[PDB]
């Protein structure tokens, strides 16, 4: 299955996940610190690694 670009953890549907619009890695929302609500106010998401 898909693995979190941050912690290497497995996708499970009891967790919120978000994808980077630049590098297209998938992440735990918890690892990159984005809640579902926060993500709603975000158009193009840039993951922490991509902000560097």
């Amino acid at each position: 299955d898909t693995l979190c670009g941050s912690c290497g953890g497995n996708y499970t549907n009891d967790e919120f996940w978000i994808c980077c619009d630049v590098c297209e890695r998938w992440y735990h929302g918890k690892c990159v610190k984005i809640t579902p609500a926060k993500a709603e106010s975000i158009k193009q998401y840039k993951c922490p690694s991509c902000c560097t």
């Binding site: 996708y11 549907n13 919120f16 158009k43």
Partner: peptide, 7 residues
Amino acid sequence: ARTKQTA
């Protein structure tokens, strides 16, 4: 953004 929501 692209997301996977909680079931």
